[PDB]
Design a protein around this ligand. Structure first.
Ligand SMILES: OB(O)c1cc2ccccc2s1
Length: 358
């Protein structure tokens, strides 16, 4: 890589790793649209397996960006509309509190206080129907944003219904494959197990716990090379050959709601560029990021703004991930770690790097 990229990455990420005691890390910097890769440490401590360009990391909630884009793609295909009632695609969801709750609300966490987590006891299809049928809202739809797996997870599940495909097969065939994300999986196949990093929590090797809607809300595993391609695809959507996917990526970066200085897309979150770094750093702390916030509708949504900081944090028990990019500058970063460390440290590091290079 150019010396300036190597310099800021080494001065920023290498000490971050020491500070946070991260066992293994992969970073990609996209600069003038071209990817550069950086690796540290071990994918598997016990086996002394190094992190490589081939190492799969758990993306955690960075998966929500794939769900958002898949949903965007279904819209572009004319299969779903965000204005449609949730009940249009789940006719058995008949309970009165769902009247007025649309796919937009599910996708953007604005249904009125759907919970962060589906309770662990909720497993089967019948359990899931019961949970949503019994759920009572904290607020009217389209008034408050509460970041929630139960919200966007259900959006992902319903978005694929008209296609008839499973969520996994829609994602594979409509997003991963056209973008040549050849080492990106919702379910890691046996052939990839040797490349699947262990996560580390309290010094113990761990992989993500199964859950209802895991595939839709936090279930993607990917390599640093595939994630760099994901960034390139989101930096320059109108260069993707598949027309509905091009549009789907664009729709996921539309601004649907505003809270403070942030805007909610489909999976992606956005701020106007240039940003106050303290806003994104402090704003990424879970005490803010998981709190209810009042939203103003952007009526109608602003199409993807090139002058944006577009980003998403992700965590599982054993992994911490971050992706951020600025389409105007053809600039982006992916940080994948096999320890879950605080969000503000990730964002701070990403800001130092991208602000040096913009
Ligand atoms: O990485 B995300 O922001 C997630 C938040 C939660 C909360 C509970 C369970 C699983 C997840 S993934």
């Amino acid at each position: 890589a150019p010396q300036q990229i190597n310099d800021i990455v080494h001065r920023t990420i290498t000490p971050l790793i020491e500070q946070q005691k991260i066992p293994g890390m992969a970073v990609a910097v996209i600069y003038q649209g071209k990817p550069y890769y950086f690796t540290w440490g071990y994918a598997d401590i016990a086996k002394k397996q190094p992190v490589t360009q081939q190492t799969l990391f758990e993306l955690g909630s960075v998966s929500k960006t794939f769900t958002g884009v898949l949903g965007g793609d279904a819209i572009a295909r004319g299969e779903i509309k965000l204005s449609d009632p949730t009940t249009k695609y789940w006719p058995e969801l008949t309970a009165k509190q769902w009247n007025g709750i649309t796919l937009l609300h599910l996708a953007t966490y604005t249904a009125g206080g759907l919970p962060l987590q589906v309770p662990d006891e909720v497993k089967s299809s019948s359990d899931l129907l019961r949970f949503y049928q019994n759920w009572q809202p904290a607020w009217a739809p389209g008034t408050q944003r509460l970041y929630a797996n139960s919200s966007i997870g259900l959006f992902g599940a319903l978005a694929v219904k008209p296609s008839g495909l499973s969520f996994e097969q829609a994602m594979q065939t409509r997003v991963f494959q056209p973008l040549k994300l050849n080492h990106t999986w919702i379910n890691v196949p046996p052939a990839e197990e040797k490349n699947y990093a262990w996560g580390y929590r309290e010094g113990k090797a761990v992989h993500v716990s199964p859950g209802a809607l895991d595939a839709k809300a936090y279930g993607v595993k990917s390599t640093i090379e595939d994630m760099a391609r994901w960034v390139q695809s989101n930096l320059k959507p109108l260069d993707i050959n598949e027309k509905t996917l091009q549009q789907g990526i664009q729709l996921a970066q539309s601004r649907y709601w505003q809270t403070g200085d942030m805007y909610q897309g489909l999976g992606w979150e956005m701020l106007d560029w240039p940003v106050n770094p303290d806003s994104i750093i402090n704003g990424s702390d879970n005490k803010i990021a998981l709190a209810a916030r009042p939203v103003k509708a952007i009526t109608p949504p602003t199409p993807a703004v090139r002058a944006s900081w577009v980003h998403k944090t992700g965590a599982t028990g054993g992994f911490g991930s971050y992706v951020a990019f600025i389409p105007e500058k053809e600039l982006g970063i992916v940080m994948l770690a096999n320890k879950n460390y605080p969000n503000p440290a990730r964002v701070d590091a990403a800001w130092q790097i991208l602000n040096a290079l913009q």
